[PDB]
Amino acid sequence: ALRYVKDYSEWSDERSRAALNYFVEGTCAAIVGVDENGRPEIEPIRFEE
Amino acid sequence: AEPILGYENALAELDVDINIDAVPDTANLAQEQFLQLTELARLYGPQEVPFDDLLELSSMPEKTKLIAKRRERSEQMAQVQAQQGQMQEQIAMQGAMAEIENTQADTAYLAARAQNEMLKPQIEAFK
Amino acid sequence: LQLTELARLYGPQEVPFDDLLELSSMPEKTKLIAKRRERSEQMAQVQAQQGQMQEQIAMQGAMAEIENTQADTAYLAARAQNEMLKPQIEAFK
Numbered sequence: 001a002l003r004y005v006k007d008y009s010e011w012s013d014e015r016s017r018a019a020l021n022y023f024v025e026g027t028c029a030a031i032v033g034v035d036e037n038g039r040p041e042i043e044p045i046r047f048e049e
Numbered sequence: 050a051e052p053i054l055g056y057e058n059a060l061a062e063l064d065v066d067i068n069i070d071a072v073p074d075t076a077n078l079a080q081e082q083f084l085q086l087t088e089l090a091r092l093y094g095p096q097e098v099p100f101d102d103l104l105e106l107s108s109m110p111e112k113t114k115l116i117a118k119r120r121e122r123s124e125q126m127a128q129v130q131a132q133q134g135q136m137q138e139q140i141a142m143q144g145a146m147a148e149i150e151n152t153q154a155d156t157a158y159l160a161a162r163a164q165n166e167m168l169k170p171q172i173e174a175f176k
Numbered sequence: 177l178q179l180t181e182l183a184r185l186y187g188p189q190e191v192p193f194d195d196l197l198e199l200s201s202m203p204e205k206t207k208l209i210a211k212r213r214e215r216s217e218q219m220a221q222v223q224a225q226q227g228q229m230q231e232q233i234a235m236q237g238a239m240a241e242i243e244n245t246q247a248d249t250a251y252l253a254a255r256a257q258n259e260m261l262k263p264q265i266e267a268f269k
Binding site for chain 2: 196249258
C-alpha cells in the first residue's frame with residue numbers, strides 16, 4: 001500500500017522532473033500531503049518557487 | 050457499500066487495480082499467451098504441458114481442420130482400451146479371484162470340523 | 177522471480193504447477209488453470225474407484241482368511257496331540 005501512492009500520483013514520470021532541476025539548478029523539492037479524500041498525494045514543487 | 054476511498058464502483062478503477070502500461074508487440078493476445086508458456090514448458094518438459102494446450106493457442110494457419118483429425122484418433126483408440134479392459138477387470142476380480150474366498154475361506158470349515166470329530170474318539174467313545 | 181531462481185536449484189520435484197503458473201505474468205490463466213484442474217479431478221475418480229475395489233479385496237477378505245485357515249488348523253495339529261495322549265496310557269490295562 002506504499003506502492004499504491006507511487007502509482008496514484010504518477011511518480012513514475014515526475015521523478016525525472018525533479019532530476020532535471022537537480023543537475024541544472026541547485027535543489028530539487030517535493031511536498032507530500034493528503035487531499036480532499038482520504039488518500040495521499042505527492043506534488044513536485046518547482047525550483048522557481 | 051459506501052465509497053471508502055472515493056471509489057464509487059469498488060470493482061475495477063484506474064488507480065488501484067488496472068495500471069495501464071506498455072509491452073512489446075504481438076498479433077493477438079493468444080500469441081502473447083503462447084510465449085510465456087513454451088518458455089515455462091521448456092524448464093519442466095513434455096510431461097505436464099501437452100498438446101491441445103500448446104498447439105491450440107499457437108500461431109498456425111489451419112488448426113481447426115487439424116485439431117479435430119487428431120482428437121478423433123484418441124477416441125477411437127480409447128474404445129479399444131476400454132472394451133479390452135472391461136473384459137479383464139471383471140474377470141481378474143469378482144470371478145476367479147473372489148472364488149479364492151470360496152475355496153480357502155471354505156476349506157476353513159473342513160480343517161475345523163475334523164477337530165470336532167477328533168474331540169469324539171478320545172472321550173465319550175469307549176467307556 | 178525469487179521462486180524460479182530457487183526452484184532451479186532443487187528442481188521440478190517440490191515446486192509444482194499451481195504454485196509457479198499461478199503467480200506468473202501470463203495474460204489468460206484463469207481460463208486455463210480451471211481446464212487443467214478438472215483433468216486432475218476426473219482422473220482421481222478413476223484412481224479411487226479402481227483402488228477401493230482392490231484395497232477391500234486384497235485385505236479383510238482373501239487376506240484375513242489366512243487367519244482362518246492357518247490360525248484354525250492350529251487347533252487340528254493341537255487336538256491330534258490330545259488324541260495321542262490317549263493310545264499310550266488309559267487305553268489298555
